[PDB]
Specification:
part of a larger assembly; 2 chains; little secondary structure; 12% helix; Spike protein S1 (chain A); viral protein; SARS-CoV-2; Spike protein; Spike glycoprotein
Chain lengths: 49, 49
């Protein structure tokens, strides 16, 4: 991954994501989310990421 | 018969009532400082606290 001055931006669209497996992983040092609860992330349907 | 606009009082009363009601019903869509104008999405997107 590049440096902070060269942050890498990527587009995610046209896919069926699954955030449950990502959340249940314990390798994350910190996981805090604003505006959306992590538990309900599997029900909302967005436009792009 | 021929000359209209001779019944101004009743029309004014009806117009005032209808306009007040329309303003009240249109006020329902205001954000009022929150993140959404509908409570259903607030329940379907956030966590109680």
């Amino acid at each position: 991954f590049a440096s902070v001055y060269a942050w890498n931006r990527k587009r995610i669209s046209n896919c069926v994501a699954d955030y449950s497996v990502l959340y249940n992983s314990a390798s994350f040092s910190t996981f805090k989310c604003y505006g959306v609860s992590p538990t309900k992330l599997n029900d909302l349907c967005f436009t792009n990421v | 018969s021929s000359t209209a606009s001779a019944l101004g009082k009743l029309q004014d009363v009806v117009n005032q009532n209808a306009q007040a009601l329309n303003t009240l019903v249109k006020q329902l869509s205001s954000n009022f400082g929150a993140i959404s104008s509908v409570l259903n999405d607030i329940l379907s997107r956030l966590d109680p606290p």
